[PDB]
Amino acid sequence: SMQEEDTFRELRIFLRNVTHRLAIDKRFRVFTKPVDPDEVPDYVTVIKQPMDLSSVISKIDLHKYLTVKDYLRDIDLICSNALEYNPDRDPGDRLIRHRACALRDTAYAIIKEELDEDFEQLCEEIQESR
Numbered sequence: 793s794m795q796e797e798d799t800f801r802e803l804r805i806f807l808r809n810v811t812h813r814l815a816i817d818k819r820f821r822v823f824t825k826p827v828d829p830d831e832v833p834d835y836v837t838v839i840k841q842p843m844d845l846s847s848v849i850s851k852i853d854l855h856k857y858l859t860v861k862d863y864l865r866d867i868d869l870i871c872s873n874a875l876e877y878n879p880d881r882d883p884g885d886r887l888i889r890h891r892a893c894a895l896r897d898t899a900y901a902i903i904k905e906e907l908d909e910d911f912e913q914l915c916e917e918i919q920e921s922r
């Protein structure tokens with residue numbers, strides 16, 4: 793229905809706005825672009841599903857997210873991948889892990905404040921109907 797297509801357009805507007813606000817934060821710069829496989833060829837041999845904020849933006853636009861739960865699965869991957877690939881005690885690794893955790897915490901706090909639970913419930917009921 794046009795009502796349902798209006799619902800998903802509003803979801804995509806909301807997801808673009810959250811993602812833009814994560815992407816412009818100086819702490820999250822390293823998560824805005826894919827890991828360069830030339831300059832880091834080991835990444836793909838040890839991380840199963842790479843994710844970054846530029847790939848989240850592409851997926852919003854290709855209509856890959858039909859719920860906020862689906863979007864948060866990708867934000868969680870950005871964080872868990874950073875923790876996996878940079879596990880050591882050196883300051884370079886500790887700083888990346890601190891910034892990865894702050895990304896996930898910031899995304900969850902925006903959504904907690906700004907997402908209406910009835911709007912997410914409607915997205916879920918339309919998704920389960922298809």
Ligand SMILES: O=C1Cc2ccc(Br)cc2N1
Pocket residue numbers: 836837838839840
């Ligand atoms: O589920 C797993 C664990 C894992 C880590 C990394 C890569 Br690449 C593939 C897999 N398979």
Ligand SMILES: [Cl-]
Pocket residue numbers: none
């Ligand atoms: Cl820096």
